[PDB]
Amino acid sequence: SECKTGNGKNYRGTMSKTKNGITCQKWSSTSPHRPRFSPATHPSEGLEENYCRNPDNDPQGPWCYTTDPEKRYDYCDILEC
Template identity: 35%
Template sequence: MLQNFSKIVIVSLIKLIYITCNDELGNLTDLSRCILSHLGLEYRGEIQKTESGVPCQAWDSEKPVHKVNISFIDEKFSDFSKKNAMNYCRNPSLHPDGPWCYSMEKNNINETCMIPLCSFSECKATGPGMEYSGKHKRGLSV
C-alpha cells in the first residue's frame, strides 16, 4: 500500500513542475509536447499512435483488442483516470522505455510511442537548476 502511495505522490509532484526559461517572456515549457524524463510519467500530450504508426487502443475500451492490465488504476495515469487518458500514450506501468499504448492490431499487443525529450539548454527544470546547460553565466542579484 505504501509503495502505491509513493508512486502517486511522485506523479503528483511531477505534475507541479514548471520549467522556467531564460527568455524575455519567461515562458513555461509545454509538457504536453515532450517528456521531461525517460519514464515520461508527467506526459499529458495527445500522441495516440505507436512508434511504428499503429493507432492506440483506448485505456477504458469496452471492446478492447487487448485486455488492459487490471492493476492500471486511474491514479496511475497522469490524467488521473483511464477515461481521461483516452487512447493517448501513457506509462501506467513505469516501463523504462517511457510512454506506450495497447495497439489496435491483434498481433501487436503494445508498443512504445515516439515522444521527444524536452530540451532545456536555456531552462532550468528544478529549483537548484543542476541540469542547466545554457549560456547564462551569472546569478541574479535581488
C-alpha cells in the same frame, strides 16, 4: 505538455500512435486487448482516450495498447522536453 522528461511517467500529452504509426487502443476498451491498466483501476495515470502513457514506469517510456490484435503494446515516439 506535448513532450516528456525521463521515462515520461508523468507525461500527459496527446500522442496516440505507436512508433510504427499504429493507432493506439482506447484505455477504456477491452478489444483487441484486455488491459492491466485502465481508468477505473488507475484514475491518476491519465488513461484518457487512446493517449500514450506510462502507468507501469517502463524505463523505455510511454506506450499504449495497440489496435493491432497481434501486437498487445508498443512504445510511442515522444518529443523530449
